[PDB]
Design a protein around this ligand. Sequence first.
Ligand SMILES: Nc1nc2c(ncn2[C@@H]2O[C@H](COP(=O)(O)OP(=O)(O)OP(=O)(O)O)[C@@H](O)[C@H]2O)c(=O)[nH]1
Ligand SMILES: Nc1nc2c(ncn2[C@@H]2O[C@H](COP(=O)(O)OP(=O)(O)O)[C@@H](O)[C@H]2O)c(=O)[nH]1
Ligand SMILES: [Mg+2]
Lengths: 155, 431, 431
Amino acid sequence: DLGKKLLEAARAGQDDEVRILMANGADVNATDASGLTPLHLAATYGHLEIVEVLLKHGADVNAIDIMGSTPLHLAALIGHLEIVEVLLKHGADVNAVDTWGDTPLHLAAIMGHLEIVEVLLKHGADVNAQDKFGKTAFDISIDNGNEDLAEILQK
Amino acid sequence: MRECISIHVGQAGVQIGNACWELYCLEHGIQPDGQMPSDKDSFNTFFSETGAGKHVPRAVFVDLEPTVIDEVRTGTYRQLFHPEQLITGKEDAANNYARGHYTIGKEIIDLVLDRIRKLADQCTGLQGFLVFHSFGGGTGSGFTSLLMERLSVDYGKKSKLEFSIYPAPQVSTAVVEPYNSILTTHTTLEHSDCAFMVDNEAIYDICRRNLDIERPTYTNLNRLISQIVSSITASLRFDGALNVDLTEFQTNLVPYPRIHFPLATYAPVISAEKAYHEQLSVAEITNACFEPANQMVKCDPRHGKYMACCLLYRGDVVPKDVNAAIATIKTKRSIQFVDWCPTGFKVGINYQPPTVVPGGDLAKVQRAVCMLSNTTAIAEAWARLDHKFDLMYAKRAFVHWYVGEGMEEGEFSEAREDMAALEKDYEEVGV
Amino acid sequence: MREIVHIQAGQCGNQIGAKFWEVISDEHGIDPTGSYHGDSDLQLERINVYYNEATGNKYVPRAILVDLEPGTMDSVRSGPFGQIFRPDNFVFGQSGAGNNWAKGHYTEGAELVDSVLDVVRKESESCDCLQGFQLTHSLGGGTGSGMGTLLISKIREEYPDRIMNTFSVMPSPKVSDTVVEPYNATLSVHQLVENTDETYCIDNEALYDICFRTLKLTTPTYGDLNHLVSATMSGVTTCLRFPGQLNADLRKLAVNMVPFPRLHFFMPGFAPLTSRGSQQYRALTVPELTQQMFDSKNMMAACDPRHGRYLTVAAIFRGRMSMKEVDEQMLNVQNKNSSYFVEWIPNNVKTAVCDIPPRGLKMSATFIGNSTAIQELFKRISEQFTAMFRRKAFLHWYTGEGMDEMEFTEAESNMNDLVSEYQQYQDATAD
Ligand SMILES: Nc1nc2c(ncn2[C@@H]2O[C@H](COP(=O)(O)OP(=O)(O)OP(=O)(O)O)[C@@H](O)[C@H]2O)c(=O)[nH]1
Ligand SMILES: Nc1nc2c(ncn2[C@@H]2O[C@H](COP(=O)(O)OP(=O)(O)O)[C@@H](O)[C@H]2O)c(=O)[nH]1
Ligand SMILES: [Mg+2]
């Protein structure tokens, strides 16, 4: 089964194995037990070159795992600015909501990724999107006392 | 003789002890090396005599850390005290009653008692003990209540008198002082025959108002206290007719064992900068004893009823002038005695004026008076403490420090209920 | 109690720990070769608390330097005071912790921990009366957090009757955007609530915001952040290092500061705020110092005190100033801001004055507060921990070191329980 091998090369950042596996029929949109695809895992571990390759060979930029996490949610959470941009350029849904009601904007705001926050706003991120507890990225800013984030959100 | 042994526990007890013994020496004409030039004695109640002509205080100083006692060991009175009667541990009770009573205190209690026994064994007719301590500190509160328990077993028939420092926020060192104050009062109540509380707030105010000291320090407070304590013990150290032994203090001032907290009032307290003050008559200083501002404890005797009242004069006081002054007090003032006590005043006159320590804040005066009275107004002092206890104890604030040091939480409630019964004891007398 | 054993673990721990020694050594008059060069008797009176006295008249820090990364050994030896530390007291590993708390707590750090206890044991057995331990470390890395919490736990089992105190620096994405830090901090806080008596929360969020918004430093460095830390650490330890009677030792500080066992995370503050070699703060008075002390901008934890209530406060004034004026202003701030102090802990603010100010200042004020507003710090970390933990990101880095996933839910649950306790006491009334 080349799917499991493609998931591990994608997580491990092995560019060479990724290309070889795809050349032998490996399912680019394979999933692990939680529903994470090679793209979800390359986006999580910061493997930009693998993210780009998967996107040129059929990867679903908006795939969701069992928890509604998209690759953009994970790139936004972990803080990979470059991957966030590549995903937005390939049609990633900036306003995708996961099982906790979080959008990527929420996750970038909580983790303090201010540059990613600016990027997501510039691409249409909904500032009124509320999580499961009714909080927007702006409320997170007020509640945490993050003046830097508040200022960025006020534009 | 009829000897008295003074025990000084903790920083407060020790520092006040140092100030008293300094005064006693000046009053009896004893030098800091213990020698006394050829004079004749009643001072023997408080000082032993060595074969070399040295007069040694019948005193023990105990603390769980050595800092304060080391000052005593190196100070002006370094040769006065028996060196084996200055006892110290290495580590203190951290403002925690439980530590002074249960854990740290138990490491030195047998040593302290064997040292008290060495003093006791040099006495012909030991009357009892004078114990000086703070309510608020860990040693002052916890070790003293351990010591008083042990003394009751070893010296059952002997009298025990206390001089206790009641907390004031202006000079308090701990938030838990209300707790320590209540835990020591509960455990020492049955072991103490008579207790003179000194309210640091009262003394602080007398220093500010009467002595013009902007920010009084312990040095100031202690010199004023030592002057009041000397007036209370003078009867034991000199010939006289009122309060001539420890038993007489209970007879005269404690009608019922539990309500054994006399209020002391002292006048005149004049600043050393007013050397040429016009001397105050007997009438004026006797009147001054009924003014709340001159009391050692903050409370209002006009809101209470008197059970006993002693007036201890020192100086140029003609007995007829005292009688005339008391006469005016009975007629003019609204001083209410309980119905079951003879509505009278016991009077003692010692005809030497008070002594003032060089370095002190007080002026020399020709006559002074210390009034000791057992009034129900003193229950205001307990109520103030009980209220602070109740605020912290309702949320169990700081209790873990105590239970973690060998104490059962249940002991907070037993002590507090004993304090509720004490407040009622005063209510039932004075209504 | 006299001696404190100081431990510094990890990069942050050593960096801030090295600065601590450089700053207090200047205040105590110790040159970088350990010789005394001071012109005041107060500088040596309590020197034994942090320095061991060596062969010559040479003082040596009672410090243990620890890290799994050897590179930090070199950084510390290169400093001015790098040669003052005992060489036998540098305990270092081969491979670092990789910012993984599990490597510090369970694998690499557990191999080295025994080696460290041998140096602690040597230092502790040389002490006349060991007071306790002091640790400096970060909660966001691996060595300081994972190994430091391991060390704390192994020290508490050997020396259970001693005080364990930490200077724990909290992570912030503003200073280090390594996203596993909330995991490391949360796992550390769980250890800290159970095994320390006193922890000073030094929040990098607040250190960054002070440098950036107040000191107008466009690009704060760790040197700028550490300048604030060293000034705070000098302030909070003043009472332990100079003669005094309030909070003079770790245990008395703890009984006054900690009303409930788990609520022992203090929010320190300092005034005036200053940058490295600016000397801007000059015209600063007692009322200004007193108001600045209680301002949010002066707090070393990113918490607004006006969003909670103070359970206890210890304030330390340093310099030549009127004790009367300090009494007055401190009372004024409590009356003016009555709503920010819990009513059920009477006289919960304690004030100390030390005559010696810090280096480069004539007047200074340090604030040590136990405020329910500290829950804003924990809620911030909790939220970041939950964001990450929900998606299970990088959990394999921890479970791969034999760490059970339920140790994460237990830490999270404990931290959430801690936040709920602060709110319980913030809403509690006297009634
Ligand atoms: N009047 C007066 N009060 C004092 C003196 N020293 C301390 N106090 C008060 O006593 C209380 C503290 O008790 P301390 O005697 O200092 O403590 P301790 O008995 O040595 O007990 P630990 O230090 O806890 O072991 C506070 O209310 C202080 O204000 C003193 O010299 N005179
Ligand atoms: N204030 C301050 N924070 C530091 C310093 N060095 C590292 N940190 C913080 O410590 C955390 C990383 O911990 P670190 O000590 O480097 O890892 P360790 O060496 O494994 O304990 C991050 O939150 C850093 O921002 C320093 O000198 N000062
Ligand atoms: Mg003491």
